[PDB]
Scaffold this active site. Structure first.
Site, PDB file in Angstrom:
ATOM      1  N   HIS A 139      24.357   1.513  24.724  1.00  0.00           N
ATOM      2  CA  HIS A 139      25.683   1.173  25.207  1.00  0.00           C
ATOM      3  C   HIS A 139      26.159   1.936  26.436  1.00  0.00           C
ATOM      4  O   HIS A 139      25.894   3.131  26.575  1.00  0.00           O
ATOM      5  CB  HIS A 139      26.671   1.401  24.066  1.00  0.00           C
ATOM      6  CG  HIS A 139      27.724   0.348  23.954  1.00  0.00           C
ATOM      7  ND1 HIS A 139      28.394  -0.155  25.050  1.00  0.00           N
ATOM      8  CD2 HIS A 139      28.234  -0.286  22.873  1.00  0.00           C
ATOM      9  CE1 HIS A 139      29.268  -1.059  24.649  1.00  0.00           C
ATOM     10  NE2 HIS A 139      29.191  -1.159  23.333  1.00  0.00           N
ATOM     11  N   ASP A 180      35.753   0.702  25.841  1.00  0.00           N
ATOM     12  CA  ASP A 180      34.636  -0.156  25.468  1.00  0.00           C
ATOM     13  C   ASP A 180      34.884  -1.568  25.955  1.00  0.00           C
ATOM     14  O   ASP A 180      35.965  -2.118  25.763  1.00  0.00           O
ATOM     15  CB  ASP A 180      34.378  -0.161  23.963  1.00  0.00           C
ATOM     16  CG  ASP A 180      33.067  -0.852  23.598  1.00  0.00           C
ATOM     17  OD1 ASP A 180      32.398  -1.414  24.496  1.00  0.00           O
ATOM     18  OD2 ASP A 180      32.700  -0.831  22.407  1.00  0.00           O
ATOM     19  N   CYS A 201      28.023  -4.301  30.087  1.00  0.00           N
ATOM     20  CA  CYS A 201      28.748  -3.055  29.805  1.00  0.00           C
ATOM     21  C   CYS A 201      28.935  -2.264  31.092  1.00  0.00           C
ATOM     22  O   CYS A 201      30.048  -2.160  31.604  1.00  0.00           O
ATOM     23  CB  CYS A 201      28.012  -2.186  28.779  1.00  0.00           C
ATOM     24  SG  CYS A 201      26.760  -3.012  27.786  1.00  0.00           S
TER      25      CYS A 201
END
Lengths: 79, 226
Positions: B115, B132, B185
């Protein structure tokens, strides 16, 4: 222009000691650290105090003194 | 209402994507190096490697100090976790020759296994915020950072930090935009930060990601944000 000591610590927590002339590029070491204690090369990174280190770079021209430690991390990928 | 992608750009970008010696060093700034390999990570829906982020976070830092913009010191990627896992004593020296309190904003790019995510210290707002792109919580991250500040203050300024008034929280799933793929991401994370550093409110959604991917490429090699 004498030798100095350098600690290379993996994020597996492993110090690998090294002797060196203070003016020579870190190519000599970076590739020795890959060969001995086997590791990729084009998949890691070196960083003296969060400052990146390119093979070009020398110790003197990075202001590392004795027993100074170098960090080395895996390459990082993600979403 | 974003910059157009001109003839010039497409033709340059398309070229850098087409594979051919991935070792080729094609942009050297902030003691960082950008190869065809590094740059490939922007094509289609690839996974953004560390180099691209650090570089972008450096430009973001450079584009601070521009009049009427919050001054930013952005952190190394390998910073967060080396602190998280090895503690302050490790990252201590990383901020020699930089007063982390001289700036308005600190930028924290975070890697956690699979991530990419972002944490933002905003001294002006007196709060830490985690970002996030998939709306996942990290209450803890902030706690770690606030602890960093506490330590840093003592180690550099030789006084304790003023905890008072400070907020810490991650951003809700619908407070900000969401990524609809697996790979965007670092793309959100980067554009997240850009948007912030400009005091601009978040604009972009998934829609603009393919474009931002292209645009980032150019921005990297030429070393200029648009």
């Amino acid at each position: 222009n004498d030798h100095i000591n350098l600690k290379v610590a993996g994020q597996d927590g492993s110090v690998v000691q090294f002797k060196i002339k203070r003016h020579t590029p870190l190519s000599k070491l970076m590739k020795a650290y890959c060969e001995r204690q086997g590791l990729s090369m084009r998949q890691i990174r070196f960083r003296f105090d969060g400052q990146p280190i390119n093979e070009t770079d020398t110790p003197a021209q990075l202001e590392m003194e004795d027993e100074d430690t170098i960090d080395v991390f895996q390459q990082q990928t993600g979403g | 209402e974003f910059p157009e992608i001109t003839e010039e750009m497409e033709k340059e970008i398309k070229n850098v994507f087409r594979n051919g010696n991935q070792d080729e060093v094609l942009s050297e700034a902030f003691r960082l190096t950008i190869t065809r390999k590094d740059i490939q990570t922007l094509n289609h829906l690839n996974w953004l490697n560390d180099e691209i982020i650090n570089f972008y976070m450096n430009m973001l830092m450079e584009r601070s100090k521009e009049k009427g913009l919050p001054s930013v010191h952005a952190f190394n990627t390998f910073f967060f976790t080396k602190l998280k896992t090895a503690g302050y004593q490790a990252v201590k020296r990383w901020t020699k020759k930089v007063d982390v309190f001289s700036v308005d904003i600190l930028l924290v790019p975070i890697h956690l296994g699979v991530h990419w995510c972002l944490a933002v210290v905003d001294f002006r707002k007196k709060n830490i915020t985690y970002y996030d792109s998939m709306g996942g919580i990290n209450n803890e991250a902030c706690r770690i950072l606030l602890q960093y500040l506490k330590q840093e203050s003592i180690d550099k300024k030789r006084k304790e930090f003023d905890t008072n008034g400070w907020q810490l929280f991650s951003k809700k799933s619908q407070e900000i935009p969401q990524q609809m793929n697996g790979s965007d991401c670092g793309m959100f994370a980067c554009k997240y930060a850009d948007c912030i550093t400009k005091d601009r409110p978040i604009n972009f959604t998934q829609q603009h990601m393919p474009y931002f991917r292209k645009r980032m490429v150019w921005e990297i090699l030429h070393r200029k944000l648009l």
